Symmetry: D3
Subunit: 156 residues, 6 copies
């Protein structure tokens, strides 16, 4: 059994890591698929994002990180899998997630499972973490130390 946990992960948050953990506890293997967007965004480049995920997940031996591009469903079936795990947090556009799940099931037969991230991590997102951190707000309890490290470096 396997699941893919896709995202842009710019940077990975403890909400993500909470979801990676739950997928890794319930599936034999987990792949974190880093899907970079077209926009010249965002903050960290591709090796940094990988680095940040790897460093935050060394305690999950059945999880690995891969760069994706193209349809999530093409990548998923690439890994020889048929399931996606996605975290739900406050502000998640769940309707659009649901639309995409129904499209992905229809076009490739892939299932999407949704899981509510833990209350304490339920209000971080990559974008909101970046905004707040770069304005001198303290988000450090909500991101992994490998992320807090590069955030602080960026601050200068």
């Amino acid at each position: 059994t396997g699941a893919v946990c896709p995202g842009s992960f710019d940077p990975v948050t403890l909400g993500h890591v909470d979801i990676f953990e739950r997928a890794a506890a319930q599936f034999d293997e987990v792949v974190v698929a880093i899907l970079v967007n077209p926009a010249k965004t965002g903050m960290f480049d591709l090796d940094e994002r990988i680095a940040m995920v790897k460093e935050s997940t060394t305690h999950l031996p059945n999880l690995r990180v891969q760069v994706g591009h193209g349809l999530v469903v093409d990548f998923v079936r690439s890994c020889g899998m048929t399931a996606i795990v996605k975290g739900l947090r406050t502000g998640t556009d769940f309707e659009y997630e649901l639309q995409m799940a129904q499209m992905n099931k229809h076009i490739a037969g892939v299932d999407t499972f949704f899981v509510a991230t833990a209350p304490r991590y339920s209000f971080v997102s990559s974008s909101l973490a970046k905004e707040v951190a770069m304005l001198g707000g303290d988000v450090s309890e909500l991101l992994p130390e490998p992320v807090n490290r590069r955030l602080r470096d960026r601050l200068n």
Copy 2:
């Protein structure tokens, strides 16, 4: 007696046709108003979008297709109509549709009727259809043949 069905229809989907059919069965006449957003393009020029809607609606003799300009409620009242029919699907920004429905009532006395599109077409949207076609996946069952016909050429 008459209803307008506005949209960018870039391109028209079978979700839209579903709604056209409900509009056309329940009102004496229907006007599909194509309103081109100055921002974007889009993928299909005005003429194509007209042709696609026409060709997908020959089975509805009481429906006609018009290029809309300016304030939507202004277009509606210039057609002599006071009704708008709008489809609801998975991922519809319903809170916003409600706001516009209220604004439109207030400014011009135009009523908005909301209808849930059929479940099999509930996850298609023009943009998701495009993204997926762009990326290789198959959305032909969710789009009318005049569209698929023009989609697979506009991918060569």
Copy 3:
């Protein structure tokens, strides 16, 4: 063309009346379907509800009032119609309404159209009006005069 406006109207409100007025301007005729339900303890008896509805709708000559038993889709087709018109107000269980709409389309081909109630009557409900009224609060500007007359009577 034709629409049915179903409900228990216990009692009818100016929210309902707004919806009625809007179905009536838009469809050739409207039937208000009063649904007796075995047996949600009601406040007013069947003919009181008929009466209040009738007395509050004297201004709409293409509207008439009937009792419905069983399936709303049976009642609708009984009237030679194929459309239902439902108001949306604050607190509407829209997800439930959507479920029933989809089921109703599937089992009988009947369309459900939803309309946003006028903002000033967006917060009335038969339930809340009853609860507030029976505790001596002033809901009179939210109900038709015929209903207000009956309400003061119960209050005694």
Copy 4:
């Protein structure tokens, strides 16, 4: 790798079966936990519900059926599992599901996965099916044949 699909299943529908199938494809073992309520009693007794589920899942050899009592999380941990799979349909009380998911994680470490049932099955529920069938409506495409058989008997 195991998941519990809990519910009252009075009767099981094809939306449920869609969920069972997906659970069964993604986990090594699945337990359908039939959880009754010390209220009323529903439509079918425990044997009928067990039987209906069994007869509808003969094609999922890694799924078994069991009566449950008490906290869902106690039963889950009884099965040696730490996961729950639950379907989403229109209109699932999703916010209440989420509350329960968070409570369940907190008191027992149990994860809940939500997955959207197929569009064609997304408007059935046990309640609505029973309501519609007993009033003479055709829900047979939405329920397994072992369920349809028994409904037909009730319609006697």
Copy 5:
């Protein structure tokens, strides 16, 4: 400047106390209104409910506890106040709370301010806390100690 926080508080939770603290910080005075509906029954009589709120709010010198009677806004105005403070949690019927807020403004000029309860207390509710306790589970970290204390004496 005063606010009322109304409820059945059967029993008071730390979700509630979180909300009291916020009302007590932002308003000079704060009346906790305990309203026991006729169908009150119930895991705690009025006296115990009062005691529990009293004992859980000694750290809030500007809050006091009273029995509410009748129209919620009648009671509010009788306290000389025109503000209600209502807590939001996962599972809150927010659409109905909105309806009531607007009815409340309309009838009595009472404003309702909604506040999100802290994430750690965002999934507790009086009935869930009882249900779980009743079935053996541990919710002691989500209830204040005067509640936990009296909760064990049900369980004997």
Copy 6:
């Protein structure tokens, strides 16, 4: 006691004014925080927005207007306050608002209270007002006369 009502107020609406009036009746003072935005195009320059807010608030002596930069919670604490009051109208992205509320509480101890805008102004927004007005529509009943004054001029 004190609250901050933040926004880009481009331009201020009677929806805003209603919220201002309500915070001012309930807190000792209110500060309107006009937030600079380096992205979002925008229509009126900072001084016009201040002016329009000032001129539409002459009747609330305990309200004043300031420009904010950076974190809302920094602005709030800057004013010696710990409370933010936001309006809810139809179309508000409440989920996003709730995410920020939780984030703001966590990084700074600041509370966010939400209050439902009056029904008559429940469908104006700066964006929709601007879009309607610049296409020749009549939104004058939904904005303060000082704004209607400036909007006429732009309509040129």
